[PDB]
Design a protein around this ligand. Structure first.
Ligand SMILES: *[C@@H]1O[C@H](CO[C@@H]2O[C@@H](C)[C@@H](O)[C@@H](O)[C@@H]2O)[C@@H](O[C@@H]2O[C@H](CO)[C@@H](O[C@@H]3O[C@H](CO[C@H]4O[C@H](CO)[C@@H](O)[C@H](O)[C@@H]4O[C@@H]4O[C@H](CO)[C@@H](O)[C@H](O)[C@H]4NC(C)=O)[C@@H](O)[C@H](O[C@H]4O[C@H](CO)[C@@H](O)[C@H](O)[C@@H]4O[C@@H]4O[C@H](CO)[C@@H](O)[C@H](O)[C@H]4NC(C)=O)[C@@H]3O)[C@H](O)[C@H]2NC(C)=O)[C@H](O)[C@H]1NC(C)=O
Ligand SMILES: C[C@H](N[C@H](C(=O)O)[C@@H]1CCCN1C(=O)[C@@H](N)CC(=O)O)C(=O)N1CCC[C@H]1C(=O)O
Ligand SMILES: *[C@@H]1O[C@H](CO)[C@@H](O)[C@H](O)[C@H]1NC(C)=O
Ligand SMILES: [Cl-]
Ligand SMILES: [Cl-]
Ligand SMILES: [Zn+2]
Length: 577
């Protein structure tokens, strides 16, 4: 009966709101005040939501969805039939919950110490080392130490986590957890589609990689850089070498056309975390998009707290499933990297607000990549010289400043393409069983080399587990969303820029105040997960595929410049060595 399924989805919707609100609450209080008490209440809430998932999930499995007419309801009920971890038996469930908590805690409390010296945490201390040191040995100490302390200490947990997460996935009808993750895109040709997109970014990536390697050779010396081989992983200004913008000063295309450092100018002008967020909020409302509620400003945590309350640091955006309470938790330090992350996070908030009227089973992005992309789109505009000058963070013309800006953007956007691509290639193969605990690490390095062209500055040994040294691995947060985000963000930027009348090169576009550009994003974001994503894509861009066109078009003047430059020096692209 259509009426029985309709009634059920109404009850699911009412009851979910309450239980998910409760559990978000508990999880929030834990996250912004790690204690015994907050931790106890959390795992108690863990069991409550698992029991609701089981109750609702079991009833939903009694519907023949074949027989269901109405498509919204068919779709809602098919989502409810996935129990996720609630499929596991009592014991396995308790055990998996404990495993995930133990992995996150290990990661977040890991420190690296000098003998009779300081102990350094990851944020800000080690990341500052990785960003600002130009000493080979000091970068290696930080790079190696972080792996020794965080990555190895994850190893004890990983095999059992794989086993439990695969087990929940098979219990929900998937072959393994990777298949369950891929299913979120509802795109049977996903792996081939992402492959094609990755192959289209190779010219730009290879060219950027060779010019960077040359510049490293100049700074770090002929004996430590092979001009035909992989780059050492510790030299790119970032712990995971996933974004290279911290070595912009070693690689500037035109040193004669100098510019202010945003970070230095933000400090210089007394920017606070709160101002960074107010600036993001102003960009959204300039587009006709929704302002964050007054409650957001009272309840969010926008910097490390200062009352000796312990908190998890990783920037994250939070929906509380009541349609009115939305929050960010970020240990925001005052620089451009975090100003971008602020926009990222406000992007997530904006999406939650846009889809707040749908049934909760549909309160998701068109696909995880859309959810990741929203804030980054706005931040493309924020990063332009034009926009930075208007925030009073840049002095203000030339081709030289142009190629210089493109290079800055490239070190963040292009460099991240192979990294964002490889993370889940690795995990898809762990979950399907083709990588075992005997070769986790070797297999990670094989992908680091194949996709990024990097090598480990130090030989890895058995017992190393470098993947565990990246947050998303112990946290069990899927990563391909980030590769998707980075492709489709340039597509959305191109469409919104056209929406706004911009003409000339795409990288000069700034959509600030464009109501036409707001309208494109709003109608798509309003759809939540109610329709296949190509429909949201078609609303924004006028067509329904993922395409690297827009990213290539953005970077085209830089590609030309890199080609002439690498050719003049005879660079050999790639790293056969
Ligand atoms: C297949 O079934 C689906 C699913 O049906 C729904 O769920 C099942 C289980 C049963 O309960 C159903 O009774 C139930 O409807 C059908 O899809 C639904 O179709 C209707 C139209 O038939 C759509 O109606 C529109 O819904 C929006 C938004 O809805 C939420 O938010 C409102 C504002 O806060 C509120 O009024 C609503 O009650 C609703 O509330 C939320 O509900 C969810 C649970 O469902 C809950 O989780 C939330 O927390 C809760 N939030 C709150 C605040 O409590 C509504 O705003 C729309 O208004 C327009 O629609 C009128 C008629 O269509 C139109 O005449 C009006 O003029 C108005 O149109 C627009 O108005 C705006 C603002 O005034 C104006 O600016 C515009 O210009 C104007 N546009 C024009 C020109 O029309 C409207 O009521 C449901 O959204 C839709 N459900 C979803 C989300 O998909 C589907 O029809 C079925 N298919 C077939 C073939 O039969
Ligand atoms: C800084 C960012 N933190 C994540 C994010 O904001 O996506 C956090 C942790 C992962 C989940 N999360 C959330 O906010 C979700 N609850 C939001 C949602 O899922 O809707 C992050 O990790 N990024 C950003 C670019 C590359 C990548 C990296 O840094 O390696
Ligand atoms: C932090 O956690 C403790 C333990 O539950 C609690 O009693 C205290 O009130 C919390 N502090 C604040 C200000 O939230
Ligand atoms: Cl690594
Ligand atoms: Cl994903
Ligand atoms: Zn995100």
């Amino acid at each position: 009966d259509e009426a029985e399924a309709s009634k059920f989805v109404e009850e699911y919707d009412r009851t979910s709101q309450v239980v998910w609100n409760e559990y978000a609450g508990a999880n929030w209080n834990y996250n912004t005040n790690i204690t015994t008490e907050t931790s106890k209440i959390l795992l108690q809430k863990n069991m409550q939501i698992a029991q609701h998932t089981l109750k609702y999930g079991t009833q939903a499995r009694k519907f023949d969805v074949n027989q269901l007419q109405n498509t919204t309801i068919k779709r809602i009920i098919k989502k409810v039939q996935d129990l996720e971890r609630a499929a596991l038996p009592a014991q396995e469930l308790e055990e998996y919950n404990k495993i995930l908590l133990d992995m996150e805690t290990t990661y977040s409390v890991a420190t690296v110490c000098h003998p009779q010296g300081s102990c350094l945490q990851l944020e800000p201390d080690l990341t500052n080392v990785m960003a600002t040191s130009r000493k080979y040995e000091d970068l290696l100490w930080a790079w190696e130490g972080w792996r020794d302390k965080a990555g190895r200490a994850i190893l004890q947990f990983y095999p059992k986590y794989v086993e439990l997460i695969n087990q929940a996935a098979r219990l929900n009808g998937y072959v393994d957890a990777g298949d369950s993750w891929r299913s979120m895109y509802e795109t049977p040709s996903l792996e081939q589609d992402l492959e094609r997109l990755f192959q289209e970014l190779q010219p730009l990536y290879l060219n950027l990689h060779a010019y960077v390697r040359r510049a490293l050779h100049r700074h770090y010396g002929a004996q430590h850089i092979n001009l035909e081989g992989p780059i050492p992983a510790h030299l790119l200004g970032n712990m995971w070498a996933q974004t290279w913008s911290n070595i912009y000063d070693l690689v500037v295309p035109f040193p004669s056309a100098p510019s202010m450092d945003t970070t230095e100018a933000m400090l210089k002008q007394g920017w606070t975390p709160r101002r960074m967020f107010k600036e993001a909020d102003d960009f959204f409302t300039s587009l006709g998009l929704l302002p964050v509620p007054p409650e957001f400003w009272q309840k969010s945590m926008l910097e490390k707290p200062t009352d000796g309350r312990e908190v998890v640091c990783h920037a994250s955006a939070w929906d509380f499933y009541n349609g009115k309470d939305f929050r960010i938790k970020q240990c925001t330090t005052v620089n451009l990297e975090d100003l971008v992350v602020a926009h990222h996070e406000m992007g997530h908030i904006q999406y939650f607000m846009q889809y707040k009227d749908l049934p909760v089973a549909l309160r998701e992005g068109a696909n995880p990549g859309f959810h990741e992309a929203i804030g980054d789109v706005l931040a493309l505009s924020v990063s332009t010289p034009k926009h930075l000058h208007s925030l009073n963070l840049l002095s203000s013309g030339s081709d030289e400043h142009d190629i210089n800006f493109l290079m800055k953007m490239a070190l963040d956007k292009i460099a991240f393409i192979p990294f964002s691509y490889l993370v889940d290639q690795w995990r898809w193969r762990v979950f399907d069983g083709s990588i075992t605990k005997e070769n986790y690490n070797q297999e990670w390095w094989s992908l680091r080399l194949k996709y990024q062209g990097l090598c480990p500055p130090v030989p890895r040994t058995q017992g190393d587990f470098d993947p565990g040294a990246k947050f998303h691995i112990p946290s069990s947060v899927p990563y391909i969303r980030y590769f998707v985000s980075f492709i489709i963000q340039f597509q959305f930027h191109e469409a919104l820029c056209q929406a706004a009348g911009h003409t000339g090169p795409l990288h000069k576009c700034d959509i600030y105040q464009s109501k036409e550009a707001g309208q494109r994003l709003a109608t798509a974001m309003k759809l939540g997960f109610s329709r296949p994503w190509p429909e949201a894509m078609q609303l924004i861009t006028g067509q329904p595929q993922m395409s690297a066109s827009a990213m290539l078009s953005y970077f085209k003047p830089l590609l030309d410049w890199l080609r002439t430059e690498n050719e003049l020096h005879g660079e050999k692209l790639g790293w056969p060595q």
